[PDB]
Amino acid sequence: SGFRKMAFPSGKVEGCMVQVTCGTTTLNGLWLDDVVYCPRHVICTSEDMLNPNYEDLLIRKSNHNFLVQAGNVQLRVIGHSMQNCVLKLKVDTANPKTPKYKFVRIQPGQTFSVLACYNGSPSGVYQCAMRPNFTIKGSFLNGSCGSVGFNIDYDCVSFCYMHHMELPTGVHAGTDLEGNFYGPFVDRQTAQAAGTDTTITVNVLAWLYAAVINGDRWFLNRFTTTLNDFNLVAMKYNYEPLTQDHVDILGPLSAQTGIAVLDMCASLKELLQNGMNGRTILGSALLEDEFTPFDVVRQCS
Amino acid sequence: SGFRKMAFPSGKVEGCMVQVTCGTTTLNGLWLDDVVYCPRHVICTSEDMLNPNYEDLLIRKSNHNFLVQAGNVQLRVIGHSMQNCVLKLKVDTANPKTPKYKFVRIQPGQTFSVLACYNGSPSGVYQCAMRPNFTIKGSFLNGSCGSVGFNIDYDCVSFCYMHHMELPTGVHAGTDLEGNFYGPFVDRQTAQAAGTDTTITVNVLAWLYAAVINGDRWFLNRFTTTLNDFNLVAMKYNYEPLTQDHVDILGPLSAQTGIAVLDMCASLKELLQNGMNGRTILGSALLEDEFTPFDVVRQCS
Numbered sequence A, B: 001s002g003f004r005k006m007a008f009p010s011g012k013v014e015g016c017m018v019q020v021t022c023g024t025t026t027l028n029g030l031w032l033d034d035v036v037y038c039p040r041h042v043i044c045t046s047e048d049m050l051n052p053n054y055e056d057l058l059i060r061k062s063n064h065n066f067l068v069q070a071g072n073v074q075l076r077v078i079g080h081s082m083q084n085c086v087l088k089l090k091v092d093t094a095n096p097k098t099p100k101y102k103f104v105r106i107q108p109g110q111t112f113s114v115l116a117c118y119n120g121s122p123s124g125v126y127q128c129a130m131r132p133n134f135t136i137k138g139s140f141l142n143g144s145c146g147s148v149g150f151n152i153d154y155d156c157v158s159f160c161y162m163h164h165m166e167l168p169t170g171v172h173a174g175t176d177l178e179g180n181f182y183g184p185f186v187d188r189q190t191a192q193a194a195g196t197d198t199t200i201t202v203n204v205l206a207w208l209y210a211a212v213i214n215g216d217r218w219f220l221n222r223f224t225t226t227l228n229d230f231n232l233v234a235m236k237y238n239y240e241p242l243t244q245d246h247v248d249i250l251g252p253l254s255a256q257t258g259i260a261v262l263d264m265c266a267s268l269k270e271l272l273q274n275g276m277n278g279r280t281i282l283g284s285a286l287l288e289d290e291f292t293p294f295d296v297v298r299q300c301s
């Protein structure tokens, strides 16, 4: 038993991380087979921050302008192209530590592990969720661009995030590994701000199911709710709408615990109204929304 | 910026994990050089676990009684001995993936990364503190025994923990890699309880500094205090005593923020008295005590 924010073992990703330098800018890249993926903003200088014309900046680059380093080894770049907001440096060596992998774009609410990296060297691993406003609440300092997010279901590494930038509110924005931003953001230093964030209701519910699995029952009640009444209440606390999809997804946890989804919704409505009254759930005094239904089942009995 | 509970990258340890089977029990082992380390209780049947005589049960065993599997490869066990509550299985092959490592014993209040494993296969990684009561608040299911905890210093893995058991309250107990328990526990199926735990004061303070560094500043104030006055409040709230050594260790963070420790203690005092019923610091409505000064500095530098 116990319940923790648990990251995937990072080794398979660690063997892919390299340092990319262009001009005076160094950041991280992801070396898979004979390609290194990194943020295209590596090719920007000081006066290319606001309105970079990436197609124009890149045509002016030769292969030798990019210094790629895997530990001590210099990798030799033999080709470059851009795909959306990701730069793809072709190298002369295929990475012998390339794992089984895929690229997947995730939806708000999904969780993944982040391997924070500086100068091509992994620093730490932690779990994030894609927030409803398409940001993530990470821990990123200067030099962390090109750090990636991933899952590892069944020995295959699914890459879903590459870190590009920190927005003014101290939250983080990035792309999938096809270079498409999550959310309305752009890789320019023009003023940008995240939308108002909301709580990931389906995840909070899954976490309440975790709590019950782990032997907590204090927050349950004898009430139920219609789905609609639930949404009308929860939205007043900036919770995301709960959809029939979400209800379907919780069916297994419902079944294992014997607590119908809408009954659990009733408990959540009450927790929102009352707070915790000095109590905690799974070691938190807040309602946690960064565990998916799938994370709960993975981690629990 | 941002502040997240972060594990060490786990790859150096993942390469060391194997499966160990003795009779009907399978659990995890740590393969370093030509030895596999696992809990001695692997040699126990359920009957045995009530009152085990390990000396006796072990002489009755032979090398072939232990099946050790690294991935899809059987290792040949060529020797077996016990050190305290750890079994040492000598095998015919040195682990080619052995990292630079040492075995260390950590102190209460210190943190480490746990690589949770099942059937020799790494499953997840998360950070834990060794509690004052010598338990850890982990996340472990049956099969997780022999999972290890570690820190990384430069390229040296310091192994400090091996998982042995869950206590009735849902908290976890284990040994160092030399088989010495953390805490007053024994490796037998008997009645055992964690002592009442206390809050790690210096870590709470470290985390208040992290909060300040990330622009969470509301809880600050003009006041200061003394060690003596504060400690009398700490005792009252089941906080560990704050020592001069703790104040010194927080020196960097006092410097960085302009808030002196006793200055921060004044803040913490008010928080213990006055509370935070539902209000938040770094996204928590609890006073978090599982980040050390080093954790805060390392993450925030």
Ligand SMILES: COc1ccc(NC(C)=O)cc1
Pocket (backbone or CB within 6 Å): B025, B041, B044, B045, B046, B048, B049, B164, B165, B186, B187, B188, B189
């Ligand atoms: C299957 O038989 C056993 C024997 C021993 C344990 N555990 C401890 C701590 O003695 C568990 C199961």
Ligand SMILES: [Cl-]
Pocket (backbone or CB within 6 Å): A105, A106, A107, A110
């Ligand atoms: Cl998704």
Ligand code: NA
Pocket (backbone or CB within 6 Å): B220, B221, B222, B223, B224, B262, B263, B264, B266, B267
């Ligand atoms: Na103060």
